[PDB]
Design a binder for these strands. Structure first.
Lengths: 102, 177, 37, 68, 238, 102, 125
RNA sequence: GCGAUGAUCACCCCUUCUUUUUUGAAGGGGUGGGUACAAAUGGCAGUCUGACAAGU
């Protein structure tokens, strides 16, 4: 949860976390691949890294992200809908405490 | 960590596990076995507490607060141990003081009957009818049900006399009674 | 002095006056008979 | 599946009458509503107040208009 | 009046998860997810059911605008048991808790709120309700809390902002299901105070149409509120 | 909830049984409440106890409101300390007053 | 025969007592309801029975319009009029106490030390 | 195969047909009360006054 809050805060701030650095670097072997990102701020941040990715953040992509979020529990084997909801509940309180300067 | 209070309703068990799980952040496989040793894994709480601890809405409290949760829990833990010791002391003392009465009804019930009378001397002086209503408020002796309760009250009155007016009471008459 | 009272206090005040009138009636009757004798 | 014969669409219509009839008892008679509603407006108008906001709305409308 | 020892008869509403207490007085009511306590001091009604004690909470129309919608005879309320709801403008648990009651344990409620002082109150209530997910963030930027919210069945907004139709659109596009619900509480004064309230409501309806939200019905909230109305629409992505 | 209370209530906060009995029966009201056990009140004597309770209650609300409603409060108590000095000065000049004519 | 402190306490009791009593009551909605329809032919054929899926009697009841599919006392109501009247009676008492307190407030104000020309404009030292 | 070391002793859930005929056939639960403990952000229940005071 401590890591999740740190990763959650980086996403909100539009900054790239080290956990996301490593994950992208794994796919770096693929030359000239386009990266679809939900948020423009994150898209710009990923571009600055010098990764060989054409980063795109367009209104049309919102349909892709929209379908994925609908069928996310089925997309991710091994995690049920209840677990994702119960993970969201715990992470939300942790973020709310940080935002409220608790 | 509010979730644990639901997992382990048994309060005495809850305190012991709280002493081990001081901080929900600390979760190791070896620790899982150690808390698995606490009580049994048949309920499965050993796996649940690890899963809940990783992800929960509990707000971390200060180190000073945690010091009092454990220290206050030690006070509760000690009292339970002493209560068990005092209970065993009661049973032994009931046998020597009131062997006939303790044998007939029991050490705890007989001791409560003595307290309601105010003393063993008071109990032995009462008539059988008064002894029955002496334990008619906590249901100590409890239409056919009423007959036994009255019958047991008369025998309890007799047993209290053998205990009170004997220098070294035996349990021989309480057994046949 | 003027006051504003709740229901229970009114009942309590109503009851005590009823008692006081009955006592005054019982006392006066007791006096009159002994005066007659 | 909408296979209602004539008999089912009559038994149900009685149930509609049965249930609708019962709720009228809770709904209450019309006569008391006449007095009850009068009390409600009295209890409302003061507690909500809002006599002023009618005036403020008129004032704000009056100030803006060009005066000649 | 409807005093502590008073006895009432509880019967169901048209809307699933909503109930009325008969007696002398008819009170709008919801079951308590966290029995034994009231979040904002509302009255509770006790019924013994085989015996376990199920509790109820009174829904005050003067404190919740959604409740004033039910009193007015709202035809359709997408908020129903076993549905996800995104509550925008969740100042505190006064109305979200009652929404949390309707959705029940299976459903969830995403309570979004911005100001910090009411936010801390919202967190304190969310702890008692596992089905409430509080988000202390500005609704004008749904991308910030995109991670925490999944797709939702309905979107209810009480935000009293001039640009609320924009806020509703951004959240609906990102989180609302196709053919999903949209219930908007509109305060005329916050948007435009000089004109009459009827003109303001017509303008808000036009904005929602531009954002692909089909209005279904509208209802003024008198006498519970003045210059207020609730608009219910369905989200037509197609 | 304490910060939103006027200093008058903080003065008589713990004496509600006596307060409302006095108000309804046309009698004098209490003047110390729960603050009677504060150190500064004890230092006062005679009728000065009633006066210091009024002064100390007023400064308590100032210090308390700063504690509750300050976003970036330092954990030093500097507002409380300077408030204490004002009450001590008020006590000194109030005590130095001699009712008996010299 | 009473003082200002006594009257103030009574009114404060009634105000809170009034607030509780009002919250206990229910008040029937009087708001306007409008239905949005797609086409004029749909507008003309609209009727309250079809739109809400009802019988006629439920249409009049805005507060608990049960659907037709879902469908498929003088002493008692005298207490209702008693309930609403008590909240009205707390109201009449509260304003009557308000009138008394203002008169007591005015008298104490007239007793206050001031220029009192009507108050002359004079800053108080 | 008894007993003075003690027997006995609140509420509610005639009709039709027929006859060798005076003959045959058919029609445990809920309330209430008592005792002890625990919880209520349930009730009583309403949070004093408001510009002068002290010295020459």
């Amino acid at each position: 949860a401590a890591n999740a809050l740190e990763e959650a805060n980086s996403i909100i701030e539009g900054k790239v976390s080290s956990q996301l650095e490593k994950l992208l670097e794994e796919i770096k072997k693929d030359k000239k691949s386009t990266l679809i990102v939900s948020e423009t701020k994150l898209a710009n941040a990923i571009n600055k890294l010098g990764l060989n990715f054409n980063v795109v953040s367009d209104a049309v992509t919102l349909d892709i992200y929209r379908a994925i979020k609908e069928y996310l529990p089925e997309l991710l084997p091994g995690m049920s809908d209840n677990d994702l909801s119960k993970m969201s509940l715990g992470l939300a309180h942790s973020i709310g405490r940080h935002k409220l300067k608790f | 960590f509010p979730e644990l209070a639901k997992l382990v309703p048994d309060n005495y068990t809850f305190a012991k596990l709280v002493l081990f799980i001081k901080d929900k952040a600390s979760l190791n496989d070896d620790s899982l076995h150690d808390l698995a040793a606490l009580l049994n894994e048949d309920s499965g709480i050993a796996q649940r507490v690890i899963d809940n601890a990783r992800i929960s809405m509990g707000q971390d409290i200060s180190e000073t607060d945690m010091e009092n949760v454990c220290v206050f829990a030690q006070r509760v833990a000690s009292l339970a141990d002493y209560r068990r010791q005092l209970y065993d002391y009661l049973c032994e003392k009931m046998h020597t003081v009131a062997p006939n009465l303790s044998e007939l009804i029991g050490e705890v019930i007989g001791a409560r009957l003595i307290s309601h009378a105010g003393s063993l001397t008071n109990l032995s002086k009462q008539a059988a009818s008064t002894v029955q209503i002496l334990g008619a408020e906590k249901a100590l002796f409890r239409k056919n049900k009423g007959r036994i309760s009255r019958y047991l009250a008369n025998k309890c009155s007799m047993a209290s006399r053998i205990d009170n007016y004997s220098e070294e009471p035996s349990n021989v008459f309480g057994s046949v009674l | 002095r003027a006051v504003v009272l709740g229901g229970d206090e009114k009942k309590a005040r109503s009851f005590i006056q009823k008692v006081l009138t009955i006592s005054k009636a019982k006392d006066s009757k007791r006096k009159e008979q002994k005066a007659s004798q | 599946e909408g296979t209602l014969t004539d008999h089912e669409r009559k038994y149900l219509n009685k149930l509609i009458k049965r249930n609708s009839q019962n709720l009228r008892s809770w709904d209450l008679e019309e006569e008391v509503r006449d007095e009850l509603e009068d009390i409600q407006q009295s209890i409302l108008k003061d507690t909500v107040s809002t006599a002023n906001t009618d005036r403020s709305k008129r004032r704000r409308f009056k100030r803006k208009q060009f005066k000649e | 009046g409807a005093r502590g020892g008073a006895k009432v008869v509880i019967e169901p509403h048209r809307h699933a998860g909503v109930y009325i207490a008969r007696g002398k007085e008819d009170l709008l009511v919801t079951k308590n997810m966290a029995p034994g306590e009231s979040v904002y001091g509302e009255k509770r009604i006790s019924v013994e059911e085989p015996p376990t004690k199920v509790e109820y909470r009174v829904w005050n129309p003067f404190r919740s605008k959604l409740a004033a919608g039910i009193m007015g005879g709202l035809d359709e309320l997408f908020i129903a048991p076993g549905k996800k709801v995104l509550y925008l403008g969740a100042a505190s648990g006064t109305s979200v808790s009652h929404v949390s009651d309707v959705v029940g344990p299976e459903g969830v409620v995403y309570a979004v709120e911005f100001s910090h002082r009411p936010g801390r109150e919202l967190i304190s209530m969310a702890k008692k309700r596992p089905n409430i997910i509080p988000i202390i963030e500005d609704a004008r930027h749904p991308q910030k809390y995109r991670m925490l919210i999944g797709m939702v069945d309905c979107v209810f907004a009480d935000v009293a902002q001039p640009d609320q139709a924009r806020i509703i659109a951004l959240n609906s596009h990102m989180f609302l299901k196709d053919q999903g619900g949209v219930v908007i509480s509109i305060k005329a004064n916050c948007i435009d105070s000089t004109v009459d309230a009827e003109t303001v409501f017509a303008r808000e309806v036009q904005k929602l149409r531009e954002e692909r939200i089909k209005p279904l019905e509208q209802l003024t909230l008198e006498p519970y509120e003045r210059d207020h109305c609730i608009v219910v629409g369905r989200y037509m992505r197609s | 909830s304490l910060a939103k209370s006027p200093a008058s209530t903080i003065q008589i906060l713990g004496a509600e049984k006596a307060l409302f009995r006095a108000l309804k029966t046309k009698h004098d009201t209490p003047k110390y409440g729960l603050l009677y056990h504060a150190s500064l009140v004890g230092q006062a004597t005679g009728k000065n106890k009633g006066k210091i309770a009024r002064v100390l209650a007023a400064k308590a609300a100032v210090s308390l409101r700063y504690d509750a409603l300050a976003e970036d409060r330092d954990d030093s108590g500097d507002i409380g300390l300077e408030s204490r000095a004002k009450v001590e000065n008020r006590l000194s000049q109030l005590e130095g007053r001699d009712l008996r004519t010299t | 025969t009473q003082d200002s402190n006594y009257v103030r306490t009574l009114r404060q009791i009634e105000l809170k007592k009034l607030e509780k009593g009002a919250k206990q009551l229910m008040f029937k909605s009087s708001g306007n309801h409008t239905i949005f329809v797609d086409s004029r032919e749909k507008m003309n054929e609209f009727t309250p029975e079809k739109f809400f899926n009802t019988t006629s009697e439920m249409v009049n009841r805005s507060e608990n319009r049960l659907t037709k599919d879902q469908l498929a006392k003088e002493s008692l109501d005298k207490k209702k009029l008693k309930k609403f009247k008590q909240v009205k009676q707390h109201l009449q008492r509260e304003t009557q106490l308000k009138q008394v307190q203002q008169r007591m407030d005015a008298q104490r104000e007239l007793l206050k030390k001031g220029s009192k020309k009507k108050w002359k404009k004079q800053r108080k030292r």
